[PDB]
Design an enzyme around this catalytic site. Structure first.
Site, PDB file in Angstrom:
ATOM      1  N   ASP A 149      -4.881 -13.545  -3.801  1.00  0.00           N
ATOM      2  CA  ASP A 149      -4.333 -13.459  -2.447  1.00  0.00           C
ATOM      3  C   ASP A 149      -4.534 -14.819  -1.769  1.00  0.00           C
ATOM      4  O   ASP A 149      -5.660 -15.300  -1.613  1.00  0.00           O
ATOM      5  CB  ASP A 149      -5.008 -12.389  -1.628  1.00  0.00           C
TER       6      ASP A 149
ATOM      7  N   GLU B  67     -10.859  -6.247  -5.057  1.00  0.00           N
ATOM      8  CA  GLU B  67     -10.791  -7.318  -4.060  1.00  0.00           C
ATOM      9  C   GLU B  67     -12.083  -7.331  -3.233  1.00  0.00           C
ATOM     10  O   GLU B  67     -12.325  -6.418  -2.428  1.00  0.00           O
ATOM     11  CB  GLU B  67      -9.597  -7.032  -3.140  1.00  0.00           C
TER      12      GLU B  67
ATOM     13  N   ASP C 270      -1.318 -12.804   1.197  1.00  0.00           N
ATOM     14  CA  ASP C 270      -1.841 -11.737   2.089  1.00  0.00           C
ATOM     15  C   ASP C 270      -2.191 -12.409   3.387  1.00  0.00           C
ATOM     16  O   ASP C 270      -3.259 -12.984   3.496  1.00  0.00           O
ATOM     17  CB  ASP C 270      -3.022 -10.997   1.494  1.00  0.00           C
TER      18      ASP C 270
ATOM     19  N   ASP D 219       2.310   1.886   3.400  1.00  0.00           N
ATOM     20  CA  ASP D 219       3.286   0.973   3.989  1.00  0.00           C
ATOM     21  C   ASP D 219       4.696   1.344   3.540  1.00  0.00           C
ATOM     22  O   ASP D 219       5.662   1.083   4.287  1.00  0.00           O
ATOM     23  CB  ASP D 219       3.114  -0.431   3.308  1.00  0.00           C
TER      24      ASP D 219
ATOM     25  N   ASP E 132      -6.301 -14.560   8.320  1.00  0.00           N
ATOM     26  CA  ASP E 132      -5.054 -14.277   7.614  1.00  0.00           C
ATOM     27  C   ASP E 132      -3.997 -15.289   8.067  1.00  0.00           C
ATOM     28  O   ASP E 132      -2.818 -14.951   8.212  1.00  0.00           O
ATOM     29  CB  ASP E 132      -4.628 -12.817   7.881  1.00  0.00           C
TER      30      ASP E 132
ATOM     31  N   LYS F  25     -14.741  -8.564  -0.267  1.00  0.00           N
ATOM     32  CA  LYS F  25     -14.714  -9.101   1.096  1.00  0.00           C
ATOM     33  C   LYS F  25     -16.116  -8.953   1.624  1.00  0.00           C
ATOM     34  O   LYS F  25     -16.747  -7.899   1.371  1.00  0.00           O
ATOM     35  CB  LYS F  25     -13.726  -8.338   2.006  1.00  0.00           C
TER      36      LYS F  25
ATOM     37  N   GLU G 184      -9.398 -13.320  -2.409  1.00  0.00           N
ATOM     38  CA  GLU G 184      -8.603 -13.786  -1.293  1.00  0.00           C
ATOM     39  C   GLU G 184      -9.238 -15.028  -0.695  1.00  0.00           C
ATOM     40  O   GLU G 184     -10.443 -15.017  -0.411  1.00  0.00           O
ATOM     41  CB  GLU G 184      -8.438 -12.706  -0.207  1.00  0.00           C
TER      42      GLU G 184
ATOM     43  N   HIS H  44     -11.367 -14.367   2.384  1.00  0.00           N
ATOM     44  CA  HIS H  44     -12.560 -13.520   2.185  1.00  0.00           C
ATOM     45  C   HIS H  44     -13.757 -14.315   1.697  1.00  0.00           C
ATOM     46  O   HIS H  44     -14.848 -14.200   2.240  1.00  0.00           O
ATOM     47  CB  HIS H  44     -12.230 -12.390   1.221  1.00  0.00           C
TER      48      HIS H  44
ATOM     49  N   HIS I 271       0.882  -1.180   0.000  1.00  0.00           N
ATOM     50  CA  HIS I 271       0.000   0.000   0.000  1.00  0.00           C
ATOM     51  C   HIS I 271       0.908   1.216   0.000  1.00  0.00           C
ATOM     52  O   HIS I 271       1.971   1.205   0.638  1.00  0.00           O
ATOM     53  CB  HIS I 271      -0.859   0.114   1.263  1.00  0.00           C
TER      54      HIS I 271
ATOM     55  N   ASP J 292     -11.509 -12.251   9.822  1.00  0.00           N
ATOM     56  CA  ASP J 292     -10.496 -12.557   8.859  1.00  0.00           C
ATOM     57  C   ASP J 292      -9.203 -12.954   9.596  1.00  0.00           C
ATOM     58  O   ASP J 292      -8.562 -12.132  10.250  1.00  0.00           O
ATOM     59  CB  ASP J 292     -10.403 -11.277   8.123  1.00  0.00           C
TER      60      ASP J 292
ATOM     61  N   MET K 288       2.708  -5.705  -7.953  1.00  0.00           N
ATOM     62  CA  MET K 288       1.396  -5.190  -7.596  1.00  0.00           C
ATOM     63  C   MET K 288       1.584  -4.104  -6.548  1.00  0.00           C
ATOM     64  O   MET K 288       2.459  -4.196  -5.664  1.00  0.00           O
ATOM     65  CB  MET K 288       0.495  -6.345  -7.090  1.00  0.00           C
TER      66      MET K 288
HETATM   67 CO   LIG Z   1      -6.143  -9.332   0.656  1.00  0.00          CO
HETATM   68 CO   LIG Z   2      -8.010 -11.166   4.845  1.00  0.00          CO
END
Ligand SMILES: [Co+2]
Ligand SMILES: [Co+2]
Ligand SMILES: [Co+2]
Ligand SMILES: [Co+2]
Ligand SMILES: [Co+2]
Ligand SMILES: [Co+2]
Ligand SMILES: [Co+2]
Ligand SMILES: [Co+2]
Lengths: 386, 386, 386, 386
Positions: free
Chosen positions: A244, A180, A286, A56, A256, A182, A216, A219, A53, A254, A87
């Site tokens: 992802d 994306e 991700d 980041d 992850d 979710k 993802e 998601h 991002h 979520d 990306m």
């Molecule tokens: Co993601």
């Molecule tokens: Co997630």
């Protein structure tokens, strides 16, 4: 021994291994990572590249000279390691200004700001070589019914994505967008909650060819959906522009988790599908190393993402190449599923008494599908129990 | 006193009030209903019409003379009562021949049969005046990953729907199709599991204008999705061709409770949206009176579907007409959500320093959305506590 | 090659392999099986025994002479094969009389009938050698809030189980009860919805020692719970009197997939726990071969239940015996988890400055748990990728 | 007009209205609140009292003089307003030292620290007049199977709660404990995931009379369970020592919406049960005003918790007092549900031919339960549509 190398095209977000461990109920458990050190560590594990991002890589609110120095150091790390940046994306969710959305905020001034912040980072993404620009509208949605008229929000969402398409076209950029989905979290319900909703929305954009999805694993699993099935629909539509990879245990927040954790058999069928279909994009993770871990556990969790993908790739390839599996797939009529129903055409089908008047429904009903024997061959291949 | 009349356009499937109460674990608790008696009973409650699967009106395997007599008696009941038949559909799920699907069965002969069985009932639907022809592919899907290649299944699904479009066009019929998504049950995962997946699929048909969706309250709720949001996306796409109303408690088996049961506030926001949008199709109930009930309880449950819709219609209209709500909607910037983000165009947005360089993110972030006061006005209107 | 033998104590219900394939939306896809043939087929696969509901062995409404002949033939099959009958149960859910429950039906006459039907089958269970008598109250519950006062229902449920305890004590039987929780399906909510609720209820019975739980993999997973954790709590309470093994994909209708399907990693950790704890009861499969299958697929699905258990048993044993895993478990402080917190006693803990005044919270917080490396060793063992 | 007053016993945690809006994906949207100002604001709304974690009232790491001043100011606010403090609790989840748990951390030194931190705050709770001491073990659990042996963790959990019971007994305190279950979040699975698991665990403590449960609406709903049913089981066990009221939309992250939001009908049946049972504890709200809101929206959301409870209390009382509802409850045999099944005793039941040999199962099966008419009377009362 399942060792990844850059040729395997594994990529990681800076925010993944860099996650400090803050959650709903907890403070950070790890210090911040310099992006330079994450590029070096990920390269040593055999990653191909990293993603980011805007915020980041460059702290939010940086001056131009600070921005230039953050980018210079990151470029040096990429050049020192051979890592790529396939990306990039925008953070339209952390800052409080996005509490009601970026592109679909009720406040118009916030929607215009979200677009300017995105466009600034598209330019940077192109400078760093990114081919895909992801957009996760995590703040687009609502906790209550009156707060968000969804038809008006989708009008605003289409305007925003159309303006971004006009911008990339105007600049002659060869970058494409990946939306994306979710279903929820952090909003009570998020707009474009699944792969299907995002694919449907893209068909109404001005230049649909510029947009695909970035599904993802976790998601789609937060809606209890079959992730391999949703990836198959995205591939069928020609819209899998990025993916992802992570793990999730069903219908929760979520999680992850590293890829291969969560629903292991769904991870197997996903790898089988990506490899059978010849998906050629990055295999992007991700994920978040759990906050129980120190830095050694962060790198072990990242390495495990890649190892699990490579184990599952070997087992899925062995399954599809096994002549006993090939025979089972014919016994289950997977070959017939791939044949057109009525290439003879509508009138021939209407005139075909074997399709109605003289179709023996009971003899067809009695024929078993043999799916359990086929699935236990798949189990045996996955577990190395052949 | 919330009394429905035929002008309210409430419709019911024969299989709803006619459900005998058989479930996974239980035998029938009620005798079969003659469709004639259900038309009479539903008309007396104030319904507008009824809908049917082929095999609910004509027992499967009937001779031509039996078929004619079932249709003659049903027509007489419609004529005696003034009831309409706005929608019909095919049963491609009960008979064992459909154990792996109709249109996406692995066996090609079954796919061709499913198409012939559908086409025969489209002709009957048109004779009875139906404008919409629903297709719920409840057997399309899988319990295991190897059993169903989803890209091949979607190719078969598109062939089938394209052939049905060619058929209706060839006959000059003014009927349109409404595809009904469901995420699972009876298959472990069903293809086109949500409104989004079905909308996306329709865009790839040969004549997309012939097809829309038939969303069901409980189906989207089986994936934990927001049903009003999904209906808003279908309306935004111009594809809400029919709707199935019922109740569901979240992520479980399909409960098919009467409308207004299950998620009451979601029922309120659904009615608010259908009425605000001027949806003009039938308000169809696809529900099951619980098997605890006798026939008096069947008719009470059916009457309750209509009563709840009318109560919620009154409360949603009062909410939107209340000047205090109108002021709250402006305080929450719902008016600004409906204004274009950048009708001034891309270059003007790029040149606008108020959108970036001179945007005060902190002052915008500090402005509360006032959504809780707006939502408690909605609560107070729904509960009659103003 | 993971071949089961009767010494492995695998058992199956008659209703599992005998399921004819009827579901919410579908007619039978297989003919009925004679229990004699299921005992023979299961023995040939290496099962240890079979279980039954009363009405699976003796059709409901049989005369005394019919009952005697069904039991005689079944006994002959058991004697011909060496198969055992370690568990039996009552069907208090199929017949319409149980539409509101057996033991907690609102109608008192139905509650008394449910008890008499249970007691008749306890006598038969003891004659056939069963040590465990399961009770799954699948109809105890509600679809609406006013229909069932849960405190009164729990009073009726305790009376019923206390009367059954008084009966077995009065007869001098050495059989114990195992109560089977389920959260929903066929009722909208079922009473005693999880292992925890059933364990809590048993503590309030008159003779708690006579009762334990019969947890089912898929039932706890229908509430999104961790099945191995719930089995650990039942073992901690000394109450795992029986267990039902199958597969489930999260929060849906009860899928009853073969064991090892559904959540594979949860199946691994379950086998690891049962084997580490030295659980000595039957490994019973309560599953349904999918209705896509013919009889050859029924027996393949049953064989796969046992094969998956044996593969997972080998991999869990190798994980726990691997000295690298033993070192990882010490690095993750699993040894310290097993040591008492304060065997020194309360006053010593209060006086211990190392527990508060001089506890370095930051040095303790900085120590990583090393759980990801431990979990990837578990992954590698499960997949045969060491 | 549903105005609460302190006599209604509504209480709020400092952390509820004081939540600054930080979530998984977002920074704070509101400034910190001084507890003094929250006590004043809550009193002005008609609350009865407030509750606290240790670290909400006294910042973690405060010196003794800082601690004394925070407590002095808070006491002055309580005295200025007449607000009470009926409950307090410990924060054993935010600080990184608790990343693997407090009472069930794998590190023994952390378990001993968690106990000392709890005991210090029990003394403060008693000084401030609290009768209930809540324990939500939000960090007790795991993300992976090898990380946490649940039988050893439950041994550590029992030691910790037994030591806390020994401590309160040793001091002569009249405070009792209320254990708060949650199924997941922030851990992948939390130990004691539901009301049932917590009730079962308490029965194995040394002095069970000292412990009850603190169920939360949204926590049981995160497992898809019926919250009123779980409260009924806790009341049946005599263990509802406290309750947390909020709203949740099914199976997601913990939303902490205001009470009455989320599942409205479940909120109605909960209020009906608490009021019918004569629950006399605080009606405590553990909720979060959404981060979209400013401070005016925080107080509006808090006021809405109390308003919704009072509206639902009026409608539930009117439902139970309506002679037409009383007649419907008898028609549905709720009176018979409350009568003992067999007060005549086991032998009389065995000898009663009306319970078996001469029970007409078909006539009993044919009697409808009339639950839909009863439920639509409940709907009409809730909506003010009688
Ligand atoms: Co993601
Ligand atoms: Co997630
Ligand atoms: Co349905
Ligand atoms: Co429907
Ligand atoms: Co089951
Ligand atoms: Co079972
Ligand atoms: Co909560
Ligand atoms: Co709480």
């Amino acid at each position: 021994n399942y060792q990844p190398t850059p040729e395997d095209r594994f990529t990681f977000g800076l925010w993944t291994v860099g996650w400090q461990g803050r959650d709903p109920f907890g403070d950070a458990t790890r210090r911040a990572l310099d992006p330079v050190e994450s590029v070096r560590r990920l390269a040593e594990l055999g990653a191909h590249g990293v993603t980011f991002h805007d915020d980041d890589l460059i702290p939010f609110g940086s001056s131009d000279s600070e921005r230039e120095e953050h980018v210079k150091r990151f470029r040096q790390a990429l050049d020192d390691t051979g890592m790529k940046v396939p990306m990039a994306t925008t953070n339209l969710f952390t800052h409080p200004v996005f509490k009601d959305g970026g592109f679909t905020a009720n406040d118009r001034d916030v929607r215009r700001y979200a677009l300017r912040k995105t466009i600034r980072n598209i330019d940077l993404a192109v400078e760093l070589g990114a081919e895909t620009y992801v957009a996760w509208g995590g703040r687009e949605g609502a906790e209550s019914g009156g707060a968000k008229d969804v038809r008006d929000a989708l009008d605003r969402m289409k305007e925003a994505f159309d303006l971004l398409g006009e911008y990339v076209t105007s600049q002659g950029y060869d970058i494409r967008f990946a939306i994306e989905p979710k279903p929820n979290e952090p909003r009570g319900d998020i707009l474009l909650p699944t792969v299907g909703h995002a694919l449907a929305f893209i068909e109404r954009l001005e230049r649909p060819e510029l947009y695909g999805v970035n599904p993802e694993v976790g998601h789609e699993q937060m809606a209890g959906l079959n992730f391999p099935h949703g990836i198959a629909q995205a591939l069928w539509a020609g819209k899998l522009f990025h993916i992802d990879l992570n793990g999730q245990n069903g219908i929760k927040y979520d999680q992850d988790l590293r890829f291969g954790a969560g629903d292991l058999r769904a991870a197997f069928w996903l790898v089988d599908l990506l490899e059978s279909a010849g998906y050629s994009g990055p295999r992007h993770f991700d994920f978040k190393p759990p906050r129980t871990e120190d830095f050694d556990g962060v790198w072990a969790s990242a390495a495990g993402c890649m190892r699990n993908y490579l184990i599952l790739k070997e087992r899925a390839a062995a399954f599809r190449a096994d002549p006993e599996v090939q025979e089972a797939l014919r016994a289950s009529r997977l070959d017939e599923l791939a044949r057109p129903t009525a290439a003879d055409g509508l009138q021939a089908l209407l005139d075909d008494r074997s399709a109605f008047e003289e179709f023996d429904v009971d003899a067809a009903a009695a024929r078993g599908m043999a799916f359990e024997r086929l699935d236990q061959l798949a189990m045996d291949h996955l577990l190395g129990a052949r």
